[PDB]
Design a protein around this ligand. Structure first.
Ligand code: VO4
Ligand code: NA
Length: 415
């Protein structure tokens, strides 16, 4: 039995789809999701870069990353197969419900092994060797240590400080996300933005005026009635697993990267190049954004409105359980759109069907940037951000993503 084994980008997509699903079932948060996407892409990309003269190794470019082992030249290895192996193995390690990765994996293994047991076996061994190397590095990123650090300390005596919001009143998510090793940033605070307008109920103050806009936008939306377009836009981008089945913003952008790669018929290495660069950038965008959320510790609009303006007002969207400034939707979309523009081009139009399996319709866009701008403004229609977190958050993600694409040297022709 010595048939060739044809590995397509769609088999990388099947691993990413599957981990996406399990992340939903397992209830991982938006910043933790971004870690789970990045490391398995890196391992798979390393295997391509070791064996393809057009792609440079990320070793020496990502913080702490050294060269992976080279393949044994006396073995016959399908490197894309090895790469899918390594992606699935690290995705398995990163989620909680491991048996749902293992069923995906075993069903592919069964066909590979049936077609060509020696090619399967040699390629799998190298993929796993490579996953062990990446996993040693990934296990030094301080994630394990932060798993036992203290919860965010809520204090009502501190007037502009973030409080848990109804219905669930969940404690703030990942208050020490800024202690995770970044991939590319010099430090987590590298893109620290300007501070938010000072919390104040003075009617002439910047903060009050922004408070009144959130309040007024929502009431204008009520007077327009359900359906409308602004409510659909807030819902499409919401991506909040704590509503009381949804994917996170990181996941949504991975789905957009997949749509672009398939629309262009990108081959396996091009597709993986795009996913790696996007997932790495989004992972540092989350670190950067969570760094600012937990520096400014800012109260979300509904709490201020209900306590001091109007006790019956409710945001169009349920408020996410973490501080306000800057907006994760803004920063993460901003970084992801800069990467994908750099990879696939300006005015890349696409139909975004990523939300079709989670309750929602298709929305079309003329460019990644238009989608990211929509993502950002959706948070104002949604009632859960003031304008600064939105606008400053876009600049933050754009600046961070520009830094990542100007730093990482991955595509690099032999020819
Ligand atoms: O994920 V947000 O920081 O846009 O509520
Ligand atoms: Na190379």
């Amino acid at each position: 039995k010595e048939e060739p084994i044809n590995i397509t980008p769609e088999e990388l997509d099947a691993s990413i789809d599957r981990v996406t699903e399990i992340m939903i079932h397992d209830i991982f948060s938006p910043p933790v999701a971004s870690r789970i996407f990045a490391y398995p892409n890196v391992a798979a990309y390393e295997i391509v870069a070791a064996t393809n003269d057009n792609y440079n190794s990320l070793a020496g470019q990502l913080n702490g990353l050294t060269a992976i082992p080279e393949p044994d030249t006396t073995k016959t290895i399908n490197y894309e197969l090895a790469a899918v192996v390594a992606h699935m193995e690290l995705s398995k390690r990163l989620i909680f419900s491991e048996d749902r990765m293992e069923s995906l994996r075993d069903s592919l293994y069964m066909v590979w092994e049936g077609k060509n047991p020696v090619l399967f076996s040699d390629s799998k061994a190298y993929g796993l060797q490579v996953a062990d190397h990446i996993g040693e590095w990934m296990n030094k990123d301080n994630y394990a240590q932060t798993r036992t650090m203290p919860k965010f300390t809520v204090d009502a005596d501190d007037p502009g400080r973030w409080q848990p919001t109804p219905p669930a009143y969940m404690d703030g998510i990942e208050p020490h996300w800024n202690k995770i090793r970044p991939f590319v940033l010099d430090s987590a605070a590298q893109f620290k933005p300007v501070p938010p307008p000072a919390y104040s109920l003075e009617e002439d103050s910047a903060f009050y005026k922004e408070l009144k806009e959130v309040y007024d936008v929502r009431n204008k939306i009520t007077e327009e009635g359900d359906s409308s377009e602004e409510i659909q836009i807030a819902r499409f981008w919401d991506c909040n697993p704590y509503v009381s089945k949804k994917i996170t913003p990181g996941a949504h952008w991975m789905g957009i990267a997949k749509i672009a790669a398939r629309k262009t018929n990108s081959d396996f290495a091009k597709t993986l190049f795009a996913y790696t660069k996007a997932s790495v950038a989004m992972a540092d965008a989350f670190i950067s954004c969570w760094d600012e959320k937990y520096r400014s510790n800012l109260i979300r609009p509904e709490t201020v409105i209900n306590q001091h303006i109007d006790d019956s007002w409710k945001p169009v969207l349920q408020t996410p359980p973490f501080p306000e400034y800057t907006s994760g939707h803004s920063v993460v979309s901003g970084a992801a759109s800069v990467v994908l523009t750099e990879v696939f081009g300006d005015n890349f139009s696409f139909d975004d069907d990523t939300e079709v399996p989670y309750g929602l319709p298709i929305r079309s866009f003329k460019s990644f940037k238009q989608a990211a701008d929509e993502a950002a403004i959706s948070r104002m229609y949604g009632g859960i951000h003031y304008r600064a977190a939105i606008e400053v958050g876009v600049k933050q993600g754009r600046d961070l993503g520009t830094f990542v694409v100007n730093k990482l040297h991955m595509l690099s022709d032999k020819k």
